[PDB]
Design a protein around this ligand. Structure first.
Ligand SMILES: CC[n+]1c(-c2ccccc2)c2cc(N)ccc2c2ccc(N)cc21
Ligand SMILES: CC[n+]1c(-c2ccccc2)c2cc(N)ccc2c2ccc(N)cc21
Lengths: 184, 184
């Protein structure tokens, strides 16, 4: 009931306006008082963390259901996961506009990031196997994730605008990202 | 001076809201009526094209003033141009955010695209020498441009948020971009 409605409103409002989406606005759009929102979530940051996990779970389920586990070559496995990733974002654009902003907000706790990484162990493992070491470090991992998110967002935008060439934007985005971020 | 007021306000508005920025908002922010805005620019698309050339010319004049012709190695010259590009965006974050939204808008005329392309000859010809075929193509050059501007904006935002490590973000952003977009 109202927990879900609050997460839907925060999805719509964060997609519409970014993190600095007003909790008054989100509460209003969920049809309760702002005091009720702060009863369900101790702080705005708690609400951000919870919404990120809910959206990440939805994305990870979608990618997992498409996984061909006979594939073991790192690049081919990552290509097919990328396809699934860009497809989810084209199919759920508000969810995706909500999630990418939470990901770079620097508001996510280490526990949340860790739970998010654990939602899809094969992808977590493939990062360890293939991403340039500097982009797995504590100092530069956020930057490597921002570069990735930037390349995936651009690919989604070009594919959504021009569906006839979506496949080709997805393939050219993937090869560019793989050259940008992976072991040489 | 109203024309310059209107271009400055359109920059701030497009940085914030993309090309869906409101002409009513832009005009009110410049201190003029919307009808006045349409006396200077008869369509929103004319405002978009004029602003894009004004911002591009500013950025290119900045890079040309910084060009060091002692650098005779192509990748190194491209790196130092990159450093000037990132520095311009860190000095002028709304200008670069607006240029990126304008460049990827599908509203620029062929005339505008031709004028932009020949503002900085050394750079135009470094691109022709270095960029992957497919990102020079009629079909996919606009996507190559989108990927570059996404990588550049990412680098700017990290360098601005964490200035202690700005040089390292600039260098890692450049190396990622070079691998993404250039030839064997
Ligand atoms: C930057 C790591 N990275 C990789 C990745 C890229 C290249 C090789 C291996 C994994 C990834 C690959 C696909 N297909 C889909 C999503 C992600 C991704 C998603 C979020 C994030 N924060 C990092 C992510
Ligand atoms: C993608 C072309 N590319 C190159 C470039 C990239 C790699 C090799 C040679 C040139 C570039 C290099 C520097 N440093 C600064 C700006 C640009 C740039 C700027 C805009 C654009 N639309 C394409 C641009």
């Amino acid at each position: 009931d109202k927990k879900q409605a609050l997460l839907e409103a925060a999805t719509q409002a964060i997609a519409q306006s970014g993190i600095a989406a007003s909790t008054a606005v989100i509460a209003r759009n969920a049809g309760v008082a702002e005091g009720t929102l702060f009863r369900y979530f101790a702080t705005k940051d708690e609400l951000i963390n919870t919404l990120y996990l809910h959206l990440k779970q939805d994305l990870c389920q979608s990618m997992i259901m498409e996984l061909d586990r006979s594939i073991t070559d790192a690049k081919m496995m990552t290509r097919f996961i990328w396809n699934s990733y860009i497809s989810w974002g084209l199919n759920h654009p508000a969810r995706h506009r909500a999630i990418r902003q939470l990901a770079v907000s620097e508001k996510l706790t280490k526990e949340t990031e860790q739970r998010a990484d654990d939602m899809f162990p094969e992808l977590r493992d493939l990062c360890h196997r293939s991403v340039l070491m500097v982009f797995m470090s504590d100092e530069y991992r956020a930057f490597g994730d921002g570069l990735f998110l930037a390349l995936a967002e651009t690919t989604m935008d070009f594919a959504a605008r021009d569906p006839a060439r979506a496949g080709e934007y997805i393939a050219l985005g993937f090869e560019a990202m793989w050259r940008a971020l992976t072991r040489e």
